[PDB]
């Protein structure tokens, strides 16, 4: 083993999920409850992000507790991660774009987890580790 995680995720299929399989994509690098809504609009938006290293799977828990709901998937390809350096001295965090005109603004966290997401997303979106 390694770490624990809520049930269902490993018992029932992901709601909305429809294509082939999730176990076919790979695994779940880093999974945690993030908050992605937009660039200041109304409020925040809690959601689950599953980094497979080949795509960013997103889940939702509209209800209370009962499995998850697959919203969309972001292929590492075309992805754009630069800890939102398009600004200047204004919160670290990072975004997850790579499409027509979509930008995923994930809320900070302040923990080894964050740095991780940035660490992987770094090599993910890219090809190989930064100066190994």
Question: Can you walk me through this structure?
Answer:
The protein has a single domain (about 1-130), classed as Pleckstrin-homology domain (PH domain)/Phosphotyrosine-binding domain (PTB) (PH-domain like, Roll), CATH 2.30.29. A hairpin with an 8-residue loop joins strand 3 and strand 4. A 4-stranded antiparallel beta sheet has the order 1-2-3-4, with no helix packed on it. The protein has a two-stranded antiparallel sheet with strand order 5-6. Helix content is about 10%, strand content about 25%. It is α+β, with helices and mostly antiparallel strands and about 130 residues long. It is globular. It has 1 helix and 6 strands.
Task: Offer a few descriptive terms.
PH-domain like; 1 helix; 23% strand; globular; signaling protein; Guanine nucleotide exchange factor; Structural Genomics; RIKEN Structural Genomics/Proteomics Initiative; rsgi
Would you list the SSEs in sequence order as H and E? EEEEEEH
Shape: globular
| Overall radius of gyration | 15 Å
- The total tally of domains equals 1
> In order across it, which strands form the biggest sheet?
1-2-3-4
- CATH class reads Mainly Beta
- Beta-strand content estimate: 15-25%
PDB class: signaling protein
Keywords: Pleckstrin homology domain, Guanine nucleotide exchange factor, Structural Genomics, RIKEN Structural Genomics/Proteomics Initiative, rsgi, signaling protein
Assembly: monomeric
Entry title: Solution Structure of the Pleckstrin Homology Domain of alpha-Pix
């Amino acid at each position: 083993g390694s770490s624990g995680s809520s049930g269902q995720i490993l018992s029932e299929p992901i709601q909305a999920w429809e294509g082939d399989d999730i176990k076919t994509l790979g695994n779940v690098i880093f999974m945690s409850q993030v908050v992605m809504q937009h660039g200041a609009c109304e409020e925040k938006e809690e959601r689950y992000f599953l980094l497979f290293s080949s795509v960013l799977i997103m889940l939702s828990a509209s209800p209370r507790m009962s499995g998850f709901m697959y919203q969309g998937k972001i292929p590492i390809a075309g992805m754009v991660v630069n800890r939102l350096d398009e600004i200047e001295g204004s919160d670290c965090m990072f975004e997850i774009t790579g499409s027509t005109v979509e930008r995923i603004v994930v809320h900070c966290n302040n923990n080894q987890d964050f740095q991780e997401w940035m660490e992987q997303l770094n090599r993910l979106t890219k090809s190989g580790p930064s100066s190994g």
